[PDB]
Nucleic acid binder design. Sequence first.
DNA 1: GTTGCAGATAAACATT
DNA 2: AATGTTTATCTGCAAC
Length: 66
Amino acid sequence: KRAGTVCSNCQTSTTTLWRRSPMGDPVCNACGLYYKLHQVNRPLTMRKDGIQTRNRKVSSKGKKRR
DNA sequence: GTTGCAGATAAACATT
DNA sequence: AATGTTTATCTGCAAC
Ligand SMILES: [Zn+2]
């Protein structure tokens, strides 16, 4: 259900992963983690239109073993 | 057999 | 410079 889903905390409609807040308020992957760590609302000065991207860290993965 | 969704890690950025 | 802090991307599981 991304149709109309807007981050309740920061209104962004672009998110890498949609989270759900303890209140049931849709939030973007960033607000969910920041909010969970600090549990406070922050100004939208950290937001950008599209999503930010970065070089994929080392291909570290659950690779193997058992 | 494929898709979708949720959650967690590690890296890099900013600050001091 | 190191640490603290932050966010993007990866994978897995369940159901059909
Ligand atoms: Zn948000």
